[PDB]
Amino acid sequence: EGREDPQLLVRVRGGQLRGIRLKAPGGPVSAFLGIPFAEPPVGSRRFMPPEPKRPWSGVLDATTFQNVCYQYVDTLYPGFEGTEMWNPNRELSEDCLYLNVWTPYPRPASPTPVLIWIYGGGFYSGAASLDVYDGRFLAQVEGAVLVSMNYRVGTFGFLALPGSREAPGNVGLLDQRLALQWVQENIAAFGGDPMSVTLFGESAGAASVGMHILSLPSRSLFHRAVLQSGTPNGPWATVSAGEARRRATLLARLVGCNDTELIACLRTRPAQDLVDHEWHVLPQESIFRFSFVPVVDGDFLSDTPEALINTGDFQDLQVLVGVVKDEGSYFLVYGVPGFSKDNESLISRAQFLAGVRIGVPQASDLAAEAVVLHYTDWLHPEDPTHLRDAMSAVVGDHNVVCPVAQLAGRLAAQGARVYAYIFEHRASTLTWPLWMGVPHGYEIEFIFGLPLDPSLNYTTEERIFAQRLMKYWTNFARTGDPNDPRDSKSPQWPPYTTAAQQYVSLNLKPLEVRRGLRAQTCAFWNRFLPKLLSA
Amino acid sequence: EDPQLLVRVRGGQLRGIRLKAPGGPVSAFLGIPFAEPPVGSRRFMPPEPKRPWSGVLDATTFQNVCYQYVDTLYPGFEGTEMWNPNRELSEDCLYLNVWTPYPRPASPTPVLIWIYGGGFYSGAASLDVYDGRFLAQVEGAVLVSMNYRVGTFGFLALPGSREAPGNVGLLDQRLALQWVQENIAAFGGDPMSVTLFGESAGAASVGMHILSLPSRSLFHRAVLQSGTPNGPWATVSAGEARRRATLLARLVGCNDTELIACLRTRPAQDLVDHEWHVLPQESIFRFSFVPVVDGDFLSDTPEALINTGDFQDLQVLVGVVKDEGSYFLVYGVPGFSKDNESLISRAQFLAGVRIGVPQASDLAAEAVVLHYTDWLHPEDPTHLRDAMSAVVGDHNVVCPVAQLAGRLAAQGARVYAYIFEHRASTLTWPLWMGVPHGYEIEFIFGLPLDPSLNYTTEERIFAQRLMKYWTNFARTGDPNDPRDSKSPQWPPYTTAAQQYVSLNLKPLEVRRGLRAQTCAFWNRFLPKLLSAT
């Protein structure tokens, strides 16, 4: 040391780190970027569970984001901001198990509650280093300690030959948990309070939070949870062991290969070869379906999430859960014919029927019919504008709105304190067409407080609005309650109950309380459809 | 000897009677035979035309009511009794009634023919709610009602047999329709402008005359109130008809000819006594002896013939009341009573659904419960009670009426649809039943215009509007007043716009969609569920 900033140097269990002093709009923050938390899961460690990071010598530099985990890159609208913002923004590498810490500057005085972010990306993509996951605003304005980790995605994180020892599955959830432990042991060196750790994530990230709630070894690593537009239950977040085994075998032939010999072969293929063939193993033409996701292994997941949700005891749990207005519109342009970001995607009755089989790829001819009958507007059963929005509503409801409604309903009936929201404000800065509404993933820039960056051309109310949600999210982190301890003038946010089924709307207007989580339509998806599909 | 009360039809001379309607007198010819009494060996057999008579036949009293089951549920209760037989029961009941203005119409006059309801097991053309004097005095119509054989006498069938070929109650109606052709001119009626209108089983009957070729030369326009030929209760297969016939024969002591013969030897009440015992399941809004799909009167199912027929020539006026299913619940489903408020448990609602949809599988019944549950209050007993009424109303009338309206429109026909939403101040059933099955009739026939009935002034004004709608539709195929301008016009129900109007004390209001979402379940999805459970 010597001439360095004395407040940027910190020790953790593996060595010394030098952070970096970043500017937030209202003051500096401390950032420790690219801390390793595991041995690089490369070579013979590919598909294996992560081992803890061996201690290093000297001062590790912790001032830039590390590699993002090896993953598919989106190429359907090259150069379009609406897709590039989610694409990797550092080098792709299998050496990628690193995490980031933002704290106030100088680091806080008392022990400060910790926020751990788990990104989404359908378990095949994502990075903790994207701009929309920037922690400097939450750390500066709310004084939070924010931690986000990289976990392995796609084949590297979730290809499983269940019951084998060289590919047990769920290693990407283990990656997440190892970062959670790392927070338990080390977050105190930054001012964070390991006794107040709140997980929050979106899409596959929310599902991940969900699975840490349902996996006993993870439950001693956090206290509160937030699930944004994602659930461990539902049709896309998990696969049986048999189905997981099926895809791993198929992918091994697609690249040219007793489980040991086969995994040994896969470990010789270039990472890009596996990415290149990852989507070819899906059983049907589908949207919102991902090849390699958490497997129900009888280990991390002792049973299916629906089983565990339906029976577990959750009185110690406090969760915030919610959805955006138009969860499914985003996914239509990635597979349903008739949809594009560039025209207005008015479709025909025929195209709606074809789309229902792609959006519900597991539906029998009869079940597919039920969906078509329930979602048709029988006064205008061929208005192409309404069949487009109905296609959007089918996919959104089936994959998010009703898996979340279902989860909120079970946890509430089983002891948990649930707070539920719908996010309805559509960012002025947004580059997707208007017909897509408020698409999947577009609350995140507001929770993280990006509109407080004046260089981002948001609007003033969008600024004020983002502070409102940062306050909601951090108050829930501190206390289990998003309501402000003081602020009694602004309206209150009731817990969600079986009785009153209350939830709030989040938009530029004050909190408005509503009832019913798409109650009628989710009864179709969560009660009738299962019984129909055993036939 | 008042010559306006003397008429010469082809079988002889009638004498009528002059009665007082509130604003003038009407000629009434009650009790005219149109068929040879179907008694003895003519039990179960097609009717034959009445033989000529000598002298001047007295047509001044209602004849007998066709032998039929008489309801016991609430003895002495008007809401029940008002549908019970008005006259002595008799298998000799094939008579019809004619009301005309007094004096007899100068020029030819459109004829309305009423076909009563009663589930094909009951009813009579002589109940007060079918009084033709108001329509004849106020709108100057000629109005004809006939009795037809109900229950085992009208509809017991051994398909293919000669001495019980089925549907003879409909042939009774058909015969009275030929009678009107050959004779109404003698009364001042126009045989070239005959409108059929009926309700419940009567509307179904009207519907079946639309679908049967011989009847199609006997009338020009049709009105179907709260009933349809299609649907779960109006017909039975030749298979299921034969089963109920030979089973009832067994419960009374009885080769087709040998079996029918032994049935023709039993007292009428021996047959009525076992009439309800032949239903396959425990049910509600199901009836043991109803028209049969015989490949003769009904060449195919009502559904097949509406799905594929040409109806460019047809003009129909179809409708429902607000609460079609509520009447029925007290006749079978535990928890429901005229007397309390029938707030029910959830489990009562699930049990009721098996009685309201007696042909439903476990999966289809769960589909019904899940679709009718209000999941914001899935246990609130007021909801489940109104839900139970609506499952029964939608399954048995509303969605069948909507199904009929849609196919007739799709295939050439001009269709007017209504929903009747006014509840009579005189009504004697509880409030929770709303506007129950049957309680628009008193208004269509103009009973509020009789002061002694203690209807309110707006109800009398209402009644006049509906009498205008129905008669106007009879003169022109169009219920709108050709002198009344004004924007609330009754639009034709079409496949695209799906417009219908509401009949209540407020002016005509146009709405769209005949309960289209939930009827999509009953008409499009539920068949697919059962046809592949």
Contact B373 A523 (CB under 8 A): yes
> What's the rounded Cα separation, in Å, for the pair B303 and B515?
19
> What's the rounded Cα separation, in Å, for the pair B431 and B454?
19
Token duo for residue A118:
């788990």
Amino acid at position B20, single letter = K
> What's the rounded Cα separation, in Å, for the pair B134 and B464?
10
In A37-107, beta strands by DSSP E: 59-61, 68-69, 92-93, 98-104
Closest CA to A472 of A222, A221, A198: A198
Comparing CB atoms, the residue among B367, B376, B525 nearest residue A515 is B376
Written as one string, the DSSP assignment of B33-102 is E-B----GGGTTS---BPPP--SEEE-BS--PEES-----SSTT-HHHHTTS-SS-EES---EEEEEEES
> What's the rounded Cα separation, in Å, for the pair A345 and A335?
13
Token duo for residue B212:
């049967």
CA distance A239 to chain B (A): 27
Prior bond of B38 cis (ω within 30°): no
Amino acid at position A321, single letter = V
A120: DSSP letter: -
Contact A370 B525 (CB under 8 A): yes
Q: Is A327 a catalytic residue?
A: yes
Token duo for residue B237:
């297969």
Closest CA to B153 of B127, B129, B118: B118
> What's the rounded Cα separation, in Å, for the pair B373 and A123?
37
Q: Is A518 strand, coil or helix?
A: coil
> What's the rounded Cα separation, in Å, for the pair A363 and A510?
41
Q: At what angle do helices B201-210 and B168-183 cross, to 10 degrees?
A: 70
Strands across the sheet with B56-58, in order? Answer: B6-9, B12-15, B56-58
Tell me which chain A residue has its CA closest to the CA of residue B373: A520
- H-helix or E-strand containing B511? strand B509-512
Closest CA to A248 of A313, A306, A302, A297: A297
Token duo for residue A226:
């937030």
Q: Which residues in chain A have Cβ-Cβ distances shorter than 8 Å to B513? A: 378-379
Kind of pairing between the strands at B109-115 and B142-146 = parallel
Q: Which residues in chain B have Cβ-Cβ distances shorter than 8 Å to A378? A: 513, 516-517, 519-520
B residues 503-522 lying closer than 8 A (beta carbon) to A: 512-513, 516-517, 519-521
> What's the rounded Cα separation, in Å, for the pair A394 and A336?
12
> What's the rounded Cα separation, in Å, for the pair A211 and A227?
11
The answer to whether the beta carbons of residues B525 and B403 sit under 8 Å apart is no
CA distance B300 to chain A (A): 27
Whether chain B has a CB inside 8 Å of the CB on A501: the answer is yes
Token duo for residue A205:
């990230």
Q: At what angle do helices A384-396 and A349-359 cross, to 10 degrees?
A: 10
The answer to whether the beta carbons of residues A450 and A443 sit under 8 Å apart is no
B138: DSSP letter: H
Q: At what angle do helices A204-214 and A171-186 cross, to 10 degrees?
A: 70
The answer to whether the beta carbons of residues A466 and A460 sit under 8 Å apart is no
The dihedral formed by the CA atoms of B431, B286, B391 and B379, expressed in degrees to the nearest 10 = 70
What distance lies between CA B31 and its chain's CA centroid? 21
Q: In sequence order, which ranges of B284-440 are alpha helices (DSSP H)?
A: 302-308, 326-329, 346-356, 362-372, 381-393, 399-410
Written as one string, the DSSP assignment of B340-372 is S-----HHHHHHHHHHHSTT--HHHHHHHHHHH
Give the number of other CB atoms < 10 A from CB of residue A60: 17
Alpha-carbon distance values, A174 to A41, A135, A507, B277 (Å): 12, 23, 36, 68
In terms of Cβ atoms closer than 10 Å to its own Cβ (0-12, 13-18, 19+), residue B3 is exposed
Terminal Cα-to-Cα distance of chain B (whole angstroms): 70
> What's the rounded Cα separation, in Å, for the pair A531 and B182?
60
Q: Is A203 a catalytic residue?
A: yes
Residue whose structure tokens are 């995605």? A153
Resolution attained, angstroms: 2.7
Closest CA to B114 of B103, B127, B104: B127
> What's the rounded Cα separation, in Å, for the pair B113 and B142?
9
The dihedral formed by the CA atoms of A338, A340, A343 and A347, expressed in degrees to the nearest 10 = 20
Kind of pairing between the strands at B24-33 and B17-21 = antiparallel
Whether chain A has a CB inside 8 Å of the CB on B375: the answer is yes
> What's the rounded Cα separation, in Å, for the pair B411 and B414?
9
- H-helix or E-strand containing A506? strand A502-506
> What's the rounded Cα separation, in Å, for the pair A417 and A317?
6
> What's the rounded Cα separation, in Å, for the pair B17 and B59?
7
In A159-241, beta strands by DSSP E: 192-202, 224-228
Q: Which residues in chain A have Cβ-Cβ distances shorter than 8 Å to B376? A: 501, 515-516, 519
Alpha-carbon distance values, B240 to A3, B158, B165, B231, B246 (Å): 99, 10, 14, 15, 10
Token duo for residue A289:
């379906």
Kind of pairing between the strands at B12-15 and B6-9 = antiparallel
Contact B376 A516 (CB under 8 A): yes
- H-helix or E-strand containing A182? helix A171-186
Contact A519 B373 (CB under 8 A): no
Indicate left, alpha or beta for A162 from its phi (over 0: left) and psi (-120 to 50: alpha): beta
Comparing CB atoms, the residue among A379, A520, A535 nearest residue B363 is A535
Q: Is B498 strand, coil or helix?
A: coil
The answer to whether the beta carbons of residues B333 and B341 sit under 8 Å apart is no
> What's the rounded Cα separation, in Å, for the pair B85 and B130?
13
Whether chain A has a CB inside 8 Å of the CB on B255: the answer is no
Q: Is B371 a catalytic residue?
A: no
> By what method was this entry solved?
X-ray
Closest CA to A279 of A298, A264, A296, A292: A292
Token duo for residue A17:
């780190």
Nearby residues of B241 by Cβ (< 8 Å), 6 or more positions away = B157, B158, B159, B166, B292
Token duo for residue B203:
């509307």
> What's the rounded Cα separation, in Å, for the pair A508 and A451?
13
What distance lies between CA B398 and its chain's CA centroid? 14
Strands across the sheet with B499-503, in order? Answer: B17-21, B24-33, B95-101, B142-146, B109-115, B189-199, B221-225, B315-321, B414-420, B499-503, B509-512
> What's the rounded Cα separation, in Å, for the pair A90 and A92?
6
The answer to whether the beta carbons of residues B41 and B264 sit under 8 Å apart is yes
The answer to whether the beta carbons of residues A214 and A303 sit under 8 Å apart is no
Contact A378 B516 (CB under 8 A): yes
Domains along chain A?
A: 1-535 (3.40.50.1820)
> What's the rounded Cα separation, in Å, for the pair A450 and A135?
9
Token duo for residue A530:
């299962």
> What's the rounded Cα separation, in Å, for the pair B463 and B461?
6
Nearby residues of B172 by Cβ (< 8 Å), 6 or more positions away = B35, B47, B94, B146, B147, B148, B149, B154
In A250-329, beta strands by DSSP E: 318-324
Whether chain A has a CB inside 8 Å of the CB on B362: the answer is no
> What's the rounded Cα separation, in Å, for the pair B438 and B355?
21
Amino acid at position A256, single letter = G
Query: Counting runs of H as helices and runs of E as strands, what totals does chain A give?
Result: 18, 16
